[PDB]
Design a protein around this ligand. Structure first.
Ligand SMILES: *[C@@H]1O[C@H](CO)[C@@H](O[C@@H]2O[C@H](CO)[C@@H](O)[C@H](O)[C@H]2NC(C)=O)[C@H](O)[C@H]1NC(C)=O
Ligand SMILES: NS(=O)(=O)c1ccc(CCNC(=S)Nc2ccc(I)cc2)cc1
Ligand SMILES: NS(=O)(=O)c1ccc(CCNC(=S)Nc2ccc(I)cc2)cc1
Ligand SMILES: *[C@@H]1O[C@H](CO)[C@@H](O)[C@H](O)[C@H]1NC(C)=O
Ligand SMILES: *[C@@H]1O[C@H](CO)[C@@H](O)[C@H](O)[C@H]1NC(C)=O
Ligand SMILES: *[C@@H]1O[C@H](CO)[C@@H](O)[C@H](O)[C@H]1NC(C)=O
Ligand SMILES: *[C@@H]1O[C@H](CO)[C@@H](O)[C@H](O)[C@H]1NC(C)=O
Ligand SMILES: [Zn+2]
Ligand SMILES: [Zn+2]
Lengths: 279, 278
């Protein structure tokens, strides 16, 4: 509402001035994920996403004016980074970033390459913090998974990411206006993760990619994309932007690339990478 | 003599010309049916791993029916149980593709054909001392099926051809049968990391070319690795062998077989694996 992607008064170039804590920082996201300048760390294990089977509550999705954001009910979806299914990270939401055109859209790049859509699965560190509102603002409170998606011409519906999303229960269209929300069938996040290799990813400490760009995010970005069709990406593009945006249709809702180590950093960060127990 | 495209020697005739075992009831490929398969949680992630002290060369041949990578002995292995103790040793990798982008794979998944199916062939070194003893004996072989799908937008480094090191450029019109060329080693571990190695169909079946021996433990990964139209067209530049009717190599896949033909004496089951978590 005080920031946008496309209105030059409030757009990404202004965030460092409008939200200095912390959009002016030097641990910002997204970054270029560079295979050659990253350190392989064999101790980083396969990611698991898993559901509390006795959870009953509804999932919703909202056009928040900046993105399409799925809101998961509490105590329902989890991430494990350590092989133990003990509720260390609890998923809160998933939102999406895409392009006006198929050659751009993602926040992260991989060796300079932009994907048409990047999904962000946002969790809080339940191991330490009892609620999301406690975690969102505090050191080390968040972990986000970045899921790239690529467009293919030939695929069965059932093998695309939209199958895991249950097609968003058909809710995406021009009438889905900010700030409306709608109930949807649940997203099968375990199926989504099975559509890529969950051992192969970049890992680094960074930030939220929208203001206030808090530097409290443990980032994991999977290298292999899940697959969607051109028709599916088009469903996002019919969403309208909020009125504080210049462009009418929602698209190009991604932040410009940040450096891993701007010149003013007082302690450099390292980009790590993981791969499966093999090779 | 056999072929894919000559109606006189082609797949419809294999059951008669090679009755052992192309007339059997445990033949491959099959349609891999998600709904009519049994999830078996005990089936673990597949690992491919290299003996880092091997230095022997890899080669590729146009054998007249496919392009076949031949790996040196004692070099590349598969583990299905998480232990790296050389139970399965990889022998070769070959490929099946179509004249057009909408067919080419031997297996289907829920009826869908992919443009290119790779077959990583290994022998059960746990029981048999050499590829030549395992290839015609019970339980001798295990093959991995790798589906590939065409994308328009991708960097070369993220395509399967990075793992293949472009086959050192040997895929071209002048690569005539039965020439063989030395190639850079194929990074099969990287290839496997391009898909989810816990998510696969598993069943007992057969070689997909004569003599169709019924001694193959099949593993077919569900998620495809990615290639470009340019890359698929390289395979289509290869010439077929002189006993094919078609000139350029393509449609070198066997028709779909049933999991359980009517005459079967003991039905087989299609299994499915997925990663721990859900
Ligand atoms: C997935 O969701 C979309 C809606 O977001 C469905 O698209 C609709 O298709 C029918 C016409 O056959 C009409 O209701 C509308 O023209 C479409 N909506 C828009 C905006 O395109 C689509 O059918 C769904 N797909 C599946 C497989 O369920
Ligand atoms: N693009 S990104 O992935 O880097 C990113 C992620 C998240 C944010 C905003 C945080 N707000 C949340 S999750 N609110 C919230 C959380 C719990 C509850 I109960 C109510 C509200 C910004 C950017
Ligand atoms: N399409 S398929 O994947 O079902 C399939 C069909 C046919 C074969 C049999 C080929 N025999 C081999 S591997 N001879 C061989 C033995 C030792 C050596 I050194 C080199 C080669 C294998 C796989
Ligand atoms: C699982 O769901 C039940 C009922 O909603 C809930 O009371 C329980 O706490 C949940 N378990 C978690 C969050 O680990
Ligand atoms: C979502 O929509 C309804 C109906 O318009 C509204 O009353 C409700 O408070 C909204 N809830 C959320 C999740 O913001
Ligand atoms: C690995 O290769 C070395 C040297 O090439 C060889 O002597 C050794 O047997 C191999 N290890 C195996 C096959 O397990
Ligand atoms: C493989 O193919 C393309 C050539 O057009 C290229 O960009 C890539 O560098 C080649 N790599 C090797 C190892 O030859
Ligand atoms: Zn985001
Ligand atoms: Zn084969």
């Amino acid at each position: 509402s005080e920031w946008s992607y496309t209105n030059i008064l409030t757009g990404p170039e202004t965030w460092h001035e409008h939200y200095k804590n912390m959009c002016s920082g030097y641990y910002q996201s997204p970054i270029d994920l560079k295979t050659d300048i990253s350190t392989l760390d064999l101790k980083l294990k396969t990611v698991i996403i898993y559901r509390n089977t006795s959870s009953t509550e509804t999932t919703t999705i909202q056009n928040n004016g900046h993105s399409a954001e799925v809101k998961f009910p509490r105590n329902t979806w989890f991430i494990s980074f350590d092989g133990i299914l003990d509720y260390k990270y609890e998923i809160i939401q998933m939102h999406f970033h895409w392009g006006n055109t198929d050659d751009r859209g993602s926040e992260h790049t991989i060796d300079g390459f932009r994907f048409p859509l990047e999904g962000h699965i946002v969790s809080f560190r339940r191991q330490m913090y009892s609620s999301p509102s406690e975690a969102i603002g505090r050191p080390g409170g968040l972990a986000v998974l970045g899921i790239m998606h690529q467009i293919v011409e030939s695929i069965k519906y059932e093998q695309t990411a939209f199958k895991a999303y249950n097609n968003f229960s058909g809710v995406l269209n021009s009438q889905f206006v900010p700030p409306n929300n709608s109930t949807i069938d649940d997203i099968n996040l375990a199926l989504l993760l099975s559509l890529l290799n969950p051992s192969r990813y970049f890992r680094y400490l960074g930030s939220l990619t929208t203001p206030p760009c808090t530097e409290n995010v443990l980032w994991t970005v999977f290298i292999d994309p899940v697959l969607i069709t051109r028709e599916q990406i088009n469903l996002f593009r019919n969403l309208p932007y909020g009125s504080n945006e210049k462009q009418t249709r929602m698209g190009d809702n991604f932040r410009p690339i940040q450096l891993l180590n701007p010149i003013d950093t007082l302690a450099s960060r390292t980009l790590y990478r993981a791969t499966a127990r093999g090779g």
